[PDB]
Nucleic acid binder design. Structure first.
Ligand SMILES: NCCC[C@H](N)CC(=O)NCCC[C@H](N)CC(=O)NCCC[C@H](N)CC(=O)N[C@@H]1[C@H](O)[C@@H](OC(N)=O)[C@@H](CO)O[C@H]1NC1=N[C@@H]2C(=O)NC[C@@H](O)[C@H]2N1
Ligand SMILES: NCCC[C@H](N)CC(=O)NCCC[C@H](N)CC(=O)NCCC[C@H](N)CC(=O)N[C@@H]1[C@H](O)[C@@H](OC(N)=O)[C@@H](CO)O[C@H]1NC1=N[C@@H]2C(=O)NC[C@@H](O)[C@H]2N1
Ligand SMILES: NCCC[C@H](N)CC(=O)NCCC[C@H](N)CC(=O)NCCC[C@H](N)CC(=O)N[C@@H]1[C@H](O)[C@@H](OC(N)=O)[C@@H](CO)O[C@H]1NC1=N[C@@H]2C(=O)NC[C@@H](O)[C@H]2N1
Lengths: 117, 211, 122, 54, 119
RNA sequence: GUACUCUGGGGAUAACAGGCUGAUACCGCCCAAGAGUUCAUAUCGACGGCGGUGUUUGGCACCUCGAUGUCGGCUCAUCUCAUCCUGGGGCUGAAGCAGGUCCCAAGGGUAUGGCUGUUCGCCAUUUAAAGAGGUACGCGAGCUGGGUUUAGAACGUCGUGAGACAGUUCGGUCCCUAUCUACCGUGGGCGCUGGAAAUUUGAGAGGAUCUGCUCCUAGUACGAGAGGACCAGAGUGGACGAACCUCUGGUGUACCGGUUGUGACGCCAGUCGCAUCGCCGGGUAGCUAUGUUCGGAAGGGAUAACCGCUGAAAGCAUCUAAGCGGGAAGCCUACCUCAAGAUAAGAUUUCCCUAGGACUUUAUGUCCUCUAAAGAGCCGUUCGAGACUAGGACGUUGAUAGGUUGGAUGUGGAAGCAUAGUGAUAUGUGAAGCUGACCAAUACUAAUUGCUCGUGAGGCUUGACU
RNA sequence: UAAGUUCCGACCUGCACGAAUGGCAUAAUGAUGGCGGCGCUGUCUCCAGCAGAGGCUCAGUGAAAUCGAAAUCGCUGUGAA
RNA sequence: CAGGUCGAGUAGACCAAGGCGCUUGAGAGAACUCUGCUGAAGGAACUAGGCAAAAUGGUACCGUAACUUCGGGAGAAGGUA
RNA sequence: GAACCCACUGUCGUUGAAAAGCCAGGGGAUGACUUGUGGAUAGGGGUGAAAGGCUAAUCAAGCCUGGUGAUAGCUGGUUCU
RNA sequence: GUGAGGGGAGUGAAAUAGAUCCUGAAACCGCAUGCAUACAAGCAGUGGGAGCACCUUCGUGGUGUGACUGCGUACCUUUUG
């Protein structure tokens, strides 16, 4: 809430209200709307959350995965309608907010320990 | 054409149902109050003068106090004219009010503002000049102008030569912006894209001159 | 964001393994190439007994970049490498297999073969 | 770089035409009656009634 | 350009500036009235007033924070036993800065910094 | 012999640039044998003739030898048109698509690399195109110093030798704080027919001016076939420019954390100083591009080459002599910005000042007393404004700045205590503690009491209205 | 090498190599000359942000080379050109 | 002459005994200049030339080519803790 | 590889802090080594692992004083009506 | 400021003979009065010439200034120039 109240009201008018709770280090699945022609479908994007930005309607989060041997990252915008659904598969236990050190690790070295209840 | 005077409130985004993120600028509009109508007979041209905002009486001078009292409107923080034709001039009278409903969603507009001031600036920033070599023997000549002219002929520097000096803090008009939202409850315009100036600056919104 | 002297991997089985960009095609003073753009390359390393040979000058299309691509919702997608797919003299793919994911900007009638052969389109 | 001709006294004085000094803003302190610099503590330590040094 | 930036430089490195302002705060808390240059006096508020706000509440953690910021046991004791109780009900503004002419050696503008209820 | 060198002189006399000239150079025109299946002139054009320009090679020796101190590269340019692309046309040995040739047109645009000191040149790959030239072969008190042309050394060659070169090779100090003119920005003064606060007209000035590809018309017109349009519409790019920070990132030495060495705070614990911010991982505002948005759209007027209508001189013919049209990225407008020092100093709205004496230089007269307006400034709190200025906001009838309170964000589990461990550590209290610049409230602190400037109805002549 | 007036190997009409003004080689050595590669990078595409020191303003002290005299504009022409 | 903690050390970081803060200051936080830190994607495309900068860097063990004057090359290269 | 002795590269400095330096890198560092004190060699002479190098900030013939007011077919200047 | 310096007083024929003190020029630098000067382009003068101020024998006069206007590119040397 570092913006003017009018901007805050205009932004708050468009907030999603069913977002789950997740943190860096968690592995998540994102259902992404894909529209070609008149054809609509949901594509799954599963991976580790390596960064989270809490900025109200300007919130974002970065998901990293290994796809066919090639690392790929996507920075989703949390309140965008293209993000249909987010599910948390497993909760991770980490020591810092940003996990960029994972980019230089491969295989067993990049494993994230599960957070035990 | 007749337009509106407002204040830049900040930038944000609007999400569409398809998921497209549209970057937008929000313009607060305190409804403009007409203070004077200028005609061919008395002024030689046709314009509508408006004021907006508020100003304390200790800052309002006596001449301006009388000028506002003749129209019968509260003193504003600024006064500004719009050139008009007879068709736009009809229906407007001294003491009336112009609101955000002058515009419609989807309309294309031009927005004028006062750009941010960068102060004294050099050739690289002001005119996109290229720097010289950082290494390879260069002596204290990394961001300098270089040559400024020819030899004995013509033996002078031409007018308009690009040099260092004040950059920014000038009137700038941006054309082709689309009205994204017209909120009458909050008296707000939401336009697509960026507009000149800093947050809190005064801006002018007019119908586009390009077609 | 590919420019001249940039080295790229090859995401196909045409035989080339590393290529170097020698020109960004499609305009005077054009600086950079992104996903879906055509470049001229020289082949720096190839597997033995292949149609392509080391030292050949060919066309290619960029399919993966580290700088990444933007999407209409404001997101960005970044890859771990810079990868290209070799084309022939009339700018058509010459390979039969595609390795690694590709993006939806390749969904044109010119590059639909890459979309069909890729393991992942994202 | 250096002049090719000595500058005349008239031109030198014309350049100096912007060198004049100005007065400070002085004011009588109503609490004490002495002249003081406006918005400043007096030399004896008074300012708008309060007194600093016992 | 320095649009919307806070802080001063005063021709010093960052560590030297921080040490100087710590010394100034200690001297102010000890004597309750000091004379310095006007820019130093104005910047000293942003360093000194939060210390009094912190000292309003007496806890071990607050005392250790005050000691980390002042490195003066006498200053910590005076803050937590005298100044904080004195300003418990004051909503900021524990200092006043008053212009005091110029300095003979270099014509530098000067000011007095004083605690609000000193004596 | 002197390149190890020195003195007195010369622009009386050479090398650079300038000047005169134009043999040479480049460009243009006249005649026309012939070539072109016939057919000089679609395109070429022998033998000969006449000019233009002032980019070449030269001639002369007028300026400079009490110094005009540079081959190329870099940075930054400005002009010409004999036009490279884009625009408009005539002819064709122009079916179409293309091409050839000539005319008009200077608005904009007009490659990156390998080799070499190169200019040039050859080569690779692009582009709509990679134009030709002038500007001290533009630019070294703006940069460099690879080549050439000091002093060292060597090779080939010449000389008995000192030494030398239609040569080669390795190495080899680039000074100047800008007075005047000019230019880029930014102020002070006065003027503008009493003074003041605002809003303005536009005589004029500057900026901008580029273009690819795909689809469609339509596989239509054209053509035997192969191929394949004009005109007219959509979509999407390159380069360039501006504004902006919502998004994506960079930075972020006054924000948070991990960690090494050492010293200290009496000790443990907890902290702080120093070591590039010690090092390392993140990161708020601001600034910023590689990020975002937008622009060169459309239309009027006069024209260039060119094409005409009607029409005589000259019973015909003829775009022309009367008269009437069409016609280009070019000109004037149109778009953006500046603009009344436009001394021709413009216009509109509103506001302020309505006192007495003496005297003679009898007048917008000179001296006394009274009066001090509308406003402006000094000063202070300051700013997304700024070198100083100027400009914007506010000064108690107050949110201008700091602080305080709340929120937001970042970091990521404070200290103390308690549990489990032999212990390093782990867990709970608790997503805690701390959080520059952000948002919102709040007179707690500082914007005090003030002073200075600016006056007192604004000359005369004539005309029209009263 | 995509592209090599440089580099390496070979050829020999050696303008004008050649045997102690030594010839041809040679391990090691060289702040020696030429060419190529890996890593690396603000050298560059193309620059951005930040830190310190100047620059700028105020107070004090206080130079320099130069200088016939200056009321010291543009263009085209003229003219020790 | 020359102490302490680490250290091979008289190298180096921080300290002891013992000395100093270098005889103009105060503000501001523009262009430009000097000295530093970081930098998206690319990685010599820069340039006469990788000039400058970036980079490597310790101890123990393993392992180490052509060539050679048998000494070297060699800390070759490379790897583990 | 420090001290010590050198001077290969670059930025800065060039009316400098300095009439040859600073900073970051660089070479030698038990030897043909570096260095204190006191001596010897004197100008067509000395000395030189040789650059015409050095011989008191001076070297293809040191400095000082005399011949000496050298000579100059050269340049400059030459005073009231 | 028990400073420097000055104003009175006093001495002296004279102190503007007051101590770096006879006379006291010029370059150069101040203050005061009069006139001119902020729409106009250049060796700064010269030949004309309105107005203003002071004086005055009251003018067909004297002193200072100089709006506006015609003409007008320093001096020396050396040179065909
Ligand atoms: N010879 C004439 C040649 C015309 C040219 N070939 C067509 C073209 O692209 N022109 C303009 C041109 O590049 C530029 O504008 C102007 N006017 O210069 C730019 C910014 O205005 O816009 C383009 N137009 C565009 N339309 C597009 C749109 O909407 N989306 C996608 C993108 O393709 C957009 N750019
Ligand atoms: N009768 C009249 C006599 C007249 C006399 N002749 C005049 C004269 O000679 N002037 C010389 C001016 C030099 C200097 N600027 C003076 C000054 O003003 N110093 C400011 C300090 C004053 C302060 N209030 C006292 C202070 O902190 N003391 C400390 C202390 O003793 C001690 O520290 C610890 N931790 O124990 C010591 C460490 O060894 O260091 C001293 N500090 C020091 N700072 C000094 C420095 O830098 N250099 C010289 C010497 O003075 C140094 N010591
Ligand atoms: N209304 C205003 C009032 C204001 C108020 N009142 C304030 C006021 O008034 N303040 C006054 C300040 C004035 C000043 N500051 C004081 C000052 O200056 N004192 C000077 C004191 C000492 C002075 N230096 C000594 C002196 O003079 N030595 C000289 C010197 O050795 C030499 O001379 C030269 N040239 O070489 C020699 C040659 O002869 O002579 C000597 N002398 C001789 N004298 C003799 C003579 O005459 N005959 C015979 C023989 O014995 C002569 N020799």
């Amino acid at each position: 809430s570092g913006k003017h109240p009018l901007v805050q009201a205009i932004e708050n008018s468009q907030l999603k209200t069913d977002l789950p709770e997740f943190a860096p280090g968690d592995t998540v699945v994102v259902q992404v709307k894909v529209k070609e022609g008149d054809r609509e479908r949901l594509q799954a994007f599963e991976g580790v959350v390596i960064a989270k930005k809490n900025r109200g309607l300007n919130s974002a989060f970065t998901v990293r995965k290994i796809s066919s041997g090639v690392g790929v990252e996507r920075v989703f915008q949390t309140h965008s309608p293209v993000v249909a659904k987010i599910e948390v598969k497993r909760r991770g236990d980490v020591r810092r907010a940003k996990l960029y050190y994972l980019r230089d690790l491969s295989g067993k070295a990049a494993r994230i320990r599960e957070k035990l209840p | 054409a007749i337009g509106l005077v407002g204040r830049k409130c900040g930038m944000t985004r609007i999400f569409t149902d398809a998921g497209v993120s549209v970057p937008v600028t929000v313009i607060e509009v305190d409804p403009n109050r007409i203070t004077q109508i200028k005609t061919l007979e008395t002024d030689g041209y046709q314009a509508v003068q408006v004021t907006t905002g508020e100003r304390r009486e200790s800052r309002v001078t006596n001449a301006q106090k009388g000028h506002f009292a003749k129209a019968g409107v509260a003193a504003g923080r600024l006064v500004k004219e719009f050139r008009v034709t007879e068709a736009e001039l009809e229906g407007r009278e001294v003491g009336g009010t112009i609101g955000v409903d002058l515009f419609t969603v989807g309309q294309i507009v031009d927005v004028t503002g006062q750009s941010k001031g960068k102060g004294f600036q050099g050739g690289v920033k002001r005119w996109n000049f290229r720097t010289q070599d950082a290494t390879h023997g260069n002596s204290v000549s990394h961001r300098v102008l270089g040559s400024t002219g020819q030899n004995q002929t013509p033996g002078r520097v031409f007018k308009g030569k690009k040099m260092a000096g004040h950059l920014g803090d000038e009137r700038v008009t941006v054309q082709g912006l689309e009205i994204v939202s017209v909120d009458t409850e909050r008296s707000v315009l939401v336009v697509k894209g960026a507009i000149p100036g800093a947050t809190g600056g005064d801006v002018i919104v007019r119908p586009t001159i390009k077609a | 964001m590919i420019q001249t002297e940039t080295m790229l991997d090859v995401a196909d089985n045409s035989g080339a393994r590393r290529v170097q960009c020698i020109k960004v095609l499609g305009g005077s003073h054009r600086r950079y190439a992104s996903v879906g753009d055509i470049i001229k390359v020289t082949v720096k390393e190839a597997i033995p007994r292949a149609r392509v040979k080391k030292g050949d000058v060919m066309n290619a299309v960029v399919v993966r970049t580290k700088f990444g691509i933007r999407r209409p919702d404001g997101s960005v997608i970044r890859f771990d490498d810079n990868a290209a797919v070799i084309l022939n003299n009339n700018k058509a793919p010459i390979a039969t297999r595609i390795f690694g994911p590709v993006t939806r900007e390749l969904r044109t009638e010119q590059f639909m073969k890459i979309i069909s052969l890729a393991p992942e389109v994202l | 770089a250096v002049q090719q001709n000595r500058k005349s006294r008239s031109r030198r004085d014309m350049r100096r035409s912007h060198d004049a000094l100005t007065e400070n803003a002085l004011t009588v302190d109503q609490a004490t009656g002495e002249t003081h610099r406006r918005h400043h503590v007096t030399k004896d330590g008074f300012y708008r009634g309060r007194q600093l040094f016992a | 350009m320095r649009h919307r930036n806070s802080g001063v430089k005063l021709g010093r490195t960052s560590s030297h500036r921080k040490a100087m302002f710590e010394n100034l705060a200690n001297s102010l808390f000890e004597h309750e009235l000091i004379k310095t240059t006007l820019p130093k006096a104005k910047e000293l508020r942003r360093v000194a007033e939060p210390l009094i706000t912190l000292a309003k509440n007496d806890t071990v953690a607050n005392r250790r924070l005050a000691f980390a910021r002042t490195r003066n046991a006498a200053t910590v004791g005076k803050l937590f036993t005298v100044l904080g109780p004195r300003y418990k009900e004051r909503n900021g503004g524990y200092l006043r800065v008053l212009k005091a002419g110029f300095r003979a050696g270099d014509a530098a503008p000067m000011a007095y910094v004083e605690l609000v209820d000193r004596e």
